[PDB]
Amino acid sequence: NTINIAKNDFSDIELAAIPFNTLADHYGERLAREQLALEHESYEMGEARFRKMFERQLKAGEVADNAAAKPLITTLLPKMIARINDWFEEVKAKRGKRPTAFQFLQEIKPEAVAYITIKTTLACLTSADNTTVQAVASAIGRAIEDEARFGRIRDLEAKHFKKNVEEQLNKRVGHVYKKAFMQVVEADMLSKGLLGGEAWSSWHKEDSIHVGVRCIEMLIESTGMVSLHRQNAGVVGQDSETIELAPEYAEAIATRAGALAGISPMFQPCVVPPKPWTGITGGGYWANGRRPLALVRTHSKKALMRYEDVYMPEVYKAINIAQNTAWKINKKVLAVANVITKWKHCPVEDIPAIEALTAWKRAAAAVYRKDKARKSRRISLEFMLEQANKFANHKAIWFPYNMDWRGRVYAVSMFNPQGNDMTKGLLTLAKGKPIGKEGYYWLKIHGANCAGVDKVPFPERIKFIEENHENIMACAKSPLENTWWAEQDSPFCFLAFCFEYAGVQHHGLSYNCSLPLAFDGSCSGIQHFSAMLRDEVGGRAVNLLPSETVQDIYGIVAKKVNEILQADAINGTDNEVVTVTDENTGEISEKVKLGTKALAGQWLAYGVTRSVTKRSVMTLAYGSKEFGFRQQVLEDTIQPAIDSGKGLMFTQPNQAAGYMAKLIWESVSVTVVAAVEAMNWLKSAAKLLAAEVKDKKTGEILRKRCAVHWVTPDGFPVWQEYKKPIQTRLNLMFLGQFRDSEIDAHKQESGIAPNFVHSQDGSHLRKTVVWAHEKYGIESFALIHDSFGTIPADAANLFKAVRETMVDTYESCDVLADFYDQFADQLHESQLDKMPALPAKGNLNLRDILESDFAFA
DNA sequence: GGAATCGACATCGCCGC
RNA sequence: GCGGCGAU
DNA sequence: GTCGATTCC
Numbered sequence: 001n002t003i004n005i006a007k008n009d010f011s012d013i014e015l016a017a018i019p020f021n022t023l024a025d026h027y028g029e030r031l032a033r034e035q036l037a038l039e040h041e042s043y044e045m046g047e048a049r050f051r052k053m054f055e056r057q058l059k060a061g062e063v064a065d066n067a068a069a070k071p072l073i074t075t076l077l078p079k080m081i082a083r084i085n086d087w088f089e090e091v092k093a094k095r096g097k098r099p100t101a102f103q104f105l106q107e108i109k110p111e112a113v114a115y116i117t118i119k120t121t122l123a124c125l126t127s128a129d130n131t132t133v134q135a136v137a138s139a140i141g142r143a144i145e146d147e148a149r150f151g152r153i154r155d156l157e158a159k160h161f162k163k164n165v166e167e168q169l170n171k172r173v174g175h176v177y178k179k180a181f182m183q184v185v186e187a188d189m190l191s192k193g194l195l196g197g198e199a200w201s202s203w204h205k206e207d208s209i210h211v212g213v214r215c216i217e218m219l220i221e222s223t224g225m226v227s228l229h230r231q232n233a234g235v236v237g238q239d240s241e242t243i244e245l246a247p248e249y250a251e252a253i254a255t256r257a258g259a260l261a262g263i264s265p266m267f268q269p270c271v272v273p274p275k276p277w278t279g280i281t282g283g284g285y286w287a288n289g290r291r292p293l294a295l296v297r298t299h300s301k302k303a304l305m306r307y308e309d310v311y312m313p314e315v316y317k318a319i320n321i322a323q324n325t326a327w328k329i330n331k332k333v334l335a336v337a338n339v340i341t342k343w344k345h346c347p348v349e350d351i352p353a354i355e356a357l358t359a360w361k362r363a364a365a366a367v368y369r370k371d372k373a374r375k376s377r378r379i380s381l382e383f384m385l386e387q388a389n390k391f392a393n394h395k396a397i398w399f400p401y402n403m404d405w406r407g408r409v410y411a412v413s414m415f416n417p418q419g420n421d422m423t424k425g426l427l428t429l430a431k432g433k434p435i436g437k438e439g440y441y442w443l444k445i446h447g448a449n450c451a452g453v454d455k456v457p458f459p460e461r462i463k464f465i466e467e468n469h470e471n472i473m474a475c476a477k478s479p480l481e482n483t484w485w486a487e488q489d490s491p492f493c494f495l496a497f498c499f500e501y502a503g504v505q506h507h508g509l510s511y512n513c514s515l516p517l518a519f520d521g522s523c524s525g526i527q528h529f530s531a532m533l534r535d536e537v538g539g540r541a542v543n544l545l546p547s548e549t550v551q552d553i554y555g556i557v558a559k560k561v562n563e564i565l566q567a568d569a570i571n572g573t574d575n576e577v578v579t580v581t582d583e584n585t586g587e588i589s590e591k592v593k594l595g596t597k598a599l600a601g602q603w604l605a606y607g608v609t610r611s612v613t614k615r616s617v618m619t620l621a622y623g624s625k626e627f628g629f630r631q632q633v634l635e636d637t638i639q640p641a642i643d644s645g646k647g648l649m650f651t652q653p654n655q656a657a658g659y660m661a662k663l664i665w666e667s668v669s670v671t672v673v674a675a676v677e678a679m680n681w682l683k684s685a686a687k688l689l690a691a692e693v694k695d696k697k698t699g700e701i702l703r704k705r706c707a708v709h710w711v712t713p714d715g716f717p718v719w720q721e722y723k724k725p726i727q728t729r730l731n732l733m734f735l736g737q738f739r740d741s742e743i744d745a746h747k748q749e750s751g752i753a754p755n756f757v758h759s760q761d762g763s764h765l766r767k768t769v770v771w772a773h774e775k776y777g778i779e780s781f782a783l784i785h786d787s788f789g790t791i792p793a794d795a796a797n798l799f800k801a802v803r804e805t806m807v808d809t810y811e812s813c814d815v816l817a818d819f820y821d822q823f824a825d826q827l828h829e830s831q832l833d834k835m836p837a838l839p840a841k842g843n844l845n846l847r848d849i850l851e852s853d854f855a856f857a
Numbered sequence: 858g859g860a861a862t863c864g865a866c867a868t869c870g871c872c873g874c
Numbered sequence: 875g876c877g878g879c880g881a882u
Numbered sequence: 883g884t885c886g887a888t889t890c891c
Contacts, residue, residue, distance in 0.1 A: 056874070160861085170876060173874070237858040297869075297879080368876075372873095376879040378874060404868060408882080414871070418881060524882080553877085622866040627884050631865090658883075665884095687887090695858095737875080745887080746864060783882045785868095864891060872877075 001250075002054065005047055010262065013040040013287040023286055027272045034271045035115045039287040043091035046265035061123025065735065068257035072249060073118055074738060076203035076223050080114040083222030083555040103215035108148045111805065112731060116143050117215040119735060121226060127244045132242045133228060134737060139214025144211050149200050150732050153819040169733070178733035193582055216243070216647025225249055234357040240359030263291045267400075267413045269391060274323045274400040277316055277818055280307050284323070284400030284412055295319070297404045312715035318766030321773050322409060325780045326430035327417065327551045327613065328514075330394045331502065332499050333425050333492055334385075336479045340486075341492060343383060345378050347422075348491050351483055353848075363643055380569070381422065387415035388426045396430040406755050406784055407762030417516075417685060418784050429780045432514025432791045439513065439792030440504055442799075446517040447472070447497040455550050458853065465501075476502035516782035516789040519799055519856030524761045524786035525621025525754075527855070531810045532760075534844040535674030542672075543854035544844065550854040553671065554610035557617055560667035561608055561660075568600035594652055602649035608660075612637050616664045620675065622754050629661035630654075677839035683753040684836050685823055686720070686752035691743040693828045694818065703828035705743040708752060710819045712763035713809045720755055722747035760815060761786055764806055764857075772801035800850075802857040807846045 015036035023032035040192035057066045088106070091098050105113060114612030120143045130392040154162055164184060182759075191197065220226060226247045232238035237791045268632065270285070277283030277295055284293040340347045389396050399411040411418050417427050435443065441462070448454065448461030456464075465472070474822045475485040478499045488494040500515045521527055522542040530539035539545060541553045573595035580589045615636055616629045626630075634657035650656050669676045686708050693703045707721035724747075727739035768788060772778045782789030790798045816838055827835060849855060 053873095060874080062874080163862095173876065236868075372878055374879095380879065383871080389871045405882060406868070409874060410869065410881095418869095423880095520882095620864050622868090625884080627865050630883095662884095691887095693873070735875085749886090750864080751867060761882095787882080859882075859891090861888100862886105863888080864886090865884090867882100872875105872876075874877105 001256045002051070002261070005258055005262040006044060008039060008564045010047075010289075010514070010800075011044045013043070013289055015040055015287075018287075020286065023272060031272045033792070036287050038134075038271060039285055039289065039746055042265040042268050043262060043289055046259045046263075049266060050257070050264055054261075058126045063126050063253075064119040064122050066257075067636065068253050069122065070738065071256060072114075072252060076118060076225065077111075077114050079222045080118065080219060081110055081468055082217045083668035084110050084114060086774050099214065100207065100210040101584070102173065104144070104148065104203075104211055105214070108144055111729060112147055112151070113524055114484065115729075116140065116147060116672060116734060117219055117312045118225075121216070121219065121243075122245075125243065125346060126182070126227065126261045131244065132217060132240055133213070134241070135380065137216060137242055138205065138225060139212060140215050141208035141211035142702045144215075145200055145203055145208060146179065146182075147731075147732060149198075150186065153182070153185065153189065154730075154732055157189055159234075159594060161193060175733060178790050182733055184531060187663055197514045216735060218244070235656050237383060264519055265289065265291055268387070269327075269397040269399055269413045269415060271394060271397060276320050277323070279491055280304060283319075286404070288460070288749055293402065297402055297410070299721075300713070301407070303405070303721070307489065307717070308356050310717055314770055315766060318403050319403070319409065320715070320767045321779075322781050322783055323399065326396040326398060326429040327389055327427055327783075328394065328396050330426055330428040330496055330499075331392055334388050336394055336495065337385060337422060337426065337492065338389065339480060341381065346372055346381070350372075351486060353487070362639075382421045384415055384507070386418065387424075396630055403762070405720075406718055406759040407712055407766075409568065409762065417782055421490050424493045425490075425494075425496045426668065427515040427516075429516050429791055430781070432512045432779060433793035434510045435504060435792050436509050438796050439794075441515065442517050443497070443500060443504070443792045446515075446795075447494065447501060450488060450490040450494035452567075457549060468783055472498050472501055473505065503691075505609050510722035513793070514780070514791050516780070517788035517792055517795045518782055518784075519795075519802060519855035521623070521761075521786040521802075522551075522855060523618065524857070526553070526672050527761045527857075528671065528757055528764070529621075529675035529678045530844070531806065531846060532815055533674035533678055533839055534842040534846070535672070536842050536844040538672035538674050539844045544850045544852055546851040548652065552610065554614040557613045557664065557667045557671055558608060558610045560671065561613065561663045562604075564663050565600045565604050565608060568596040569604055572596035572600055574598075598661065601654055602651070604654055605649040606637075606641065606646070612660070613664055613667075616661075617668055619791075620668060620672070621679075621757055623679075623750055626665035627663050627666050628655045633660045633664070634658045634804060642678060674839070674842060681816070681836055681839060682753045682756050682819075683749055684760050684834070686747070686749045688827055688831045688835060689823055690743050691746035691792070691831070702830075705748075706823075706826055708748065708758070708823065710757050710822050712757070713813045713815060714763040714844065715766050716759070716766070718755070718759050720751060722751060756819075758785075764802075764809060768798075768802050768805040769857075771805045772798050776801060786857060799856065803850045803852070803855070806857065807849050810846050 013036055015033050018036070020032055020036060023035060026032075054066065054068065054250070057063055057068075063069050083789045084105070088102070088110075091102050091642045117140050120140050122137065124139055125131055137729050140708065153165070158165055169178060169181060172181050186198070190198075216226070216228075220228065224241045225244065228241065228243055231240045234444060264623075267285075272286075274284050275282070275286050280295050281292045283295060294304055296304060296307055336345065337436050344350075348610065399413055402410050402412055404410065415423065417424060419427075434854060435441070444462050444465040445458055448464050451464070453461050453464045471484045473483070474482045475495060479485065479498075485491060485495045485498055496515060500513050503513065518777060526538060527542045527544060529535070530542060538543070541551055541556055543551050547748040574594045575595045575598050577590055577592045580591050581587065582589065614634065616624065617627070619632070634653060638647060638650050638653050638657050638660075642653070647653075689706045689708050691703075692701060692705045694701050707719055708718045711717045722744040724744035725739075725741045729739050730736045762785070765783060765785065765788070769781055769783070771791075772781075778790050778798055778801070779793045780794070781788050788798055788802055789795075820838065
């Protein structure tokens with residue numbers, strides 16, 4: 001019984017009477033009333049959303065595990081904790097056999113006791129019928145016993161052993177299975193580790209109840225949450241003493257839940273141009289919903305306000321220009337998808353084309369994950385398709401835009417161009433132009449790209465399209481009769497191209513086309529790092545400089561690796577047989593530690609290629625290094641290898657993955673030297689700035705931990721401030737949550753480089769959008785962080801625009817030095833030396849980018 | 858402070874129990 | 875919260 | 883088994 005918002009609440013967005021005479025006048029009354037309607041609907045959807053969610057929440061007593069019940073508990077828990085505290089002292093200050101409950105309740109940390117009570121109570125109260133002080137008391141007790149028993153593990157027994165537990169315990173979900181695991185654990189630890197009994201078998205259901213009972217008492221005593229009134233007093237089989245939820249406390253939850261339900265809307269497209277962003281909020285959508293769009297998706301409200309008066313004209317221009325691009329549903333594609341998707345889960349997943357236990361159980365767990373995946377994929381596919389069909393006939397739709405705290409641009413509606421192949425394929429720009437010679441040429445480039453022929457020079461791409469001219473026309477004529485399109489890397493996008501291509505054949509170069517052709521940057525991250533430090537070698541690796549062939553950084557890293565493999569197969573360390581004595585058995589065993597010579601031999605034996613290095617290098621700009629590579633290699637190639645039959649050479653998987661990681665780190669750090677140094681520097685800066693420098697002679701704070709701030713070339717300011725709570729309350733098998741905060745130095749240091757680059761490419765994208773809109777007449781854009789697109793007729797200019805905008809930015813700014821000025825005067829007196837100098841520049845000449853074909857962007 | 862050790866791949870968003 | 879999916 | 887810093891012994 002939650003306070004329905006679907007009243008005069010959402011009524012607020014009066015799609016009939018409101019100062020909307022703006023819209024009306026601007027795009028007519030119909031559209032005006034529809035936008036307001038659509039906007040209104042989004043809140044109703046959000047509401048039902050919270051509803052079905054809140055439903056299951058109660059349906060499993062997880063009502064405590066909901067934002068509707070946490071506010072109260074945050075104030076109810078202290079009251080309770082105190083009561084027990086006092087009560088404990090009241091018994092200690094009195095001789096005579098203490099109460100039954102007190103005996104046990106003295107072992108479980110009071111905080112957990114208080115909480116356990118509150119949670120387990122609410123779960124029972126939200127039960128169909130039984131709410132008897134009898135069953136409830138058993139429940140709380142049963143829950144407390146579990147805590148005292150298995151909590152002992154998380155305290156002494158597994159002081160450190162707990163590590164091999166937590167991981168698998170949290171992996172476990174559902175109170176039931178979390179108990180199964182803790183029982184087996186206990187059966188093992190006793191079989192080896194800490195020895196003792198299990199003084200809980202003695203806990204006859206008697207003790208359980210007694211415990212539960214005393215708690216409920218204290219609960220009703222410290223706070224007023226449950227009433228203990230009699231039920232049918234005067235009946236042999238009806239006179240049942242039970243518990244009821246405080247009428248008031250049930251109203252708060254309902255009210256909190258209610259209001260909440262009205263702040264989570266399911267954002268949809270617009271039927272009229274989005275509201276121009278003029279300040280920190282209120283942009284994008286038109287209606288005045290109680291959930292106003294922020295121009296920046298910040299963590300804390302405080303964070304948002306730092307933008308309130310910031311002067312950044314170019315930023316607003318960009319966001320507004322983009323947000324103004326008119327889109328529409330590619331009907332011809334929707335037709336195809338509307339049909340084949342009702343025949344296949346994933347229209348393109350299976351088309352007819354011409355160490356024991358730790359291996360079988362391995363595959364088993366995959367089977368499960370796989371099907372779970374296929375189910376979540378289909379949920380989303382269904383949504384988008386529904387969303388597509390909904391707008392299939394509008395002459396145009398638009399998408400509002402925001403930025404994350406780093407400056408990257410995001411479309412706001414759930415259904416947007418930054419989707420996936422099907423989603424993108426179902427979307428196309430509304431205002432096209434006569435294609436012309438030039439545009440047609442780019443049309444075909446894009447086709448080659450959608451088919452995966454993007455690692456070859458343009459003439460080979462055009463060749464590819466021309467040689468398949470008949471296949472394409474076929475897929476265009478009868479898409480349901482020709483599956484060739486569905487077999488390409490970007491199936492729907494490809495199909496979209498097919499149709500457009502077929503139109504040109506029929507209509508000629510006058511054909512009005514609006515398909516968005518995308519130009520993607522190679523490794524945006526490494527690209528920018530290589531530009532800001534004029535790195536020629538790395539820059540060349542990421543297609544910054546003009547070459548006749550496309551450069552493949554995964555492959556060049558791969559080749560460097562093979563050089564080391566060879567080198568090690570010849571020379572390199574030999575195996576070594578160390579002695580190992582089992583901890584349990586004390587059994588003496590011989591195990592050989594593989595040297596480089598042997599490890600090299602296996603990898604050569606396996607065959608190392610770009611596939612073994614791709615992930616590692618593409619995650620380099622996210623902070624992963626040698627350590628992080630082990631995992632990737634172990635499960636991206638060594639694992640599947642063995643599981644697929646191969647991998648026989650991989651005797652010691654971990655030893656083999658660790659070696660490879662060492663080789664991939666050695667190989668990248670010499671291929672993209674600028675990227676590695678810039679990040680190391682940025683990491684070093686954030687480290688100092690987030691440190692809490694003090695004099696260890698006073699323990700006095702000379703400089704508190706500072707956040708990291710800087711400003712992108714186009715004026716966007718960013719503040720990195722990862723905060724760490726000073727709280728702590730880890731529960732075992734029930735919950736474990738809430739209890740001031742400070743800058744979290746590790747996150748501060750781990751997110752600086754990736755966040756910097758992203759801020760950088762974010763500014764490049766905005767600059768490009770503005771430059772391309774003012775210099776060239778481009779006015780329709782397809783944006784995806786490091787991917788830029790427009791209609792064919794404007795493709796050649798955007799191709800130019802992205803390079804110009806990139807060359808100009810780095811010719812005019814030394815983002816790293818500028819960065820330095822920003823924090824320099826914030827480095828306490830004592831840390832003015834641990835700050836590495838700015839890495840030296842290289843010999844790259846940014847101007848060459850203007851002539852690099854394969855660096856779209 | 859000499860180490861026990863958490864941290865180790867970043868951001869955004871959707872769904873789910 | 876943990877798990878799955880998607881975008882870069 | 884890398885690279886360091888929050889934190890234990």
